[PDB]
Amino acid sequence: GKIQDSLSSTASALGKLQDVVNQNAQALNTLVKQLSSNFGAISSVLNDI
Amino acid sequence: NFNFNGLTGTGVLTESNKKFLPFQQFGRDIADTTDAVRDPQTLEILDIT
């Protein structure tokens, strides 16, 4: 009943799994957003050039 | 394929539940993934899947 209690109220102890999805998810968003960068081009979007 | 008044892309055009105001010409959910155009003739909102 304490095990049922401690995980149905507190959300902090699930942080170990929560990091792994978050460490996955931060890499995905920064993977896509690099297309907004020019790398010294006149435009970051490809279709304009 | 589609070309709009400055912005362009390629995909399927279907209906939508999202709403606009008198000023929008563009639409993206997160991290420059353009998905929503209210058309410049019928003034009717669409999605880009």
From Swiss-Prot, chain B:
Q: According to the lineage, what is the superkingdom?
A: Viruses
Q: Which gene encodes it?
A: S
What's this chain's function? Attaches the virion to the cell membrane by interacting with host receptor, initiating the infection. The major receptor is host ACE2. When S2/S2' has been cleaved, binding to the receptor triggers direct fusion at the cell membrane. When S2/S2' has not been cleaved, binding to the receptor results in internalization of the virus by endocytosis using host TFRC and GRM2 and leading to fusion of the virion membrane with the host endosomal membrane. Alternatively, may use NRP1/NRP2 and integrin as entry receptors.
**What organism is recorded for this protein?**
Severe acute respiratory syndrome coronavirus 2
**UniProt subunit comment:** Binds to host ACE2. RBD also interacts with the N-linked glycan on 'Asn-90' of ACE2. Cleavage of S generates a polybasic C-terminal sequence on S1 that binds to host Neuropilin-1 (NRP1) and Neuropilin-2 (NRP2) receptors. Interacts with host integrin alpha-5/beta-1 (ITGA5:ITGB1) and with ACE2 in complex with integrin alpha-5/beta-1 (ITGA5:ITGB1). May interact via cytoplasmic c-terminus with M protein. May interact (via N-terminus) with host bilirubin and biliverdin, thereby preventing antibody binding to the SARS-CoV-2 spike NTD via an allosteric mechanism.
**Would you tell me the protein name for this molecule?**
Spike protein S1
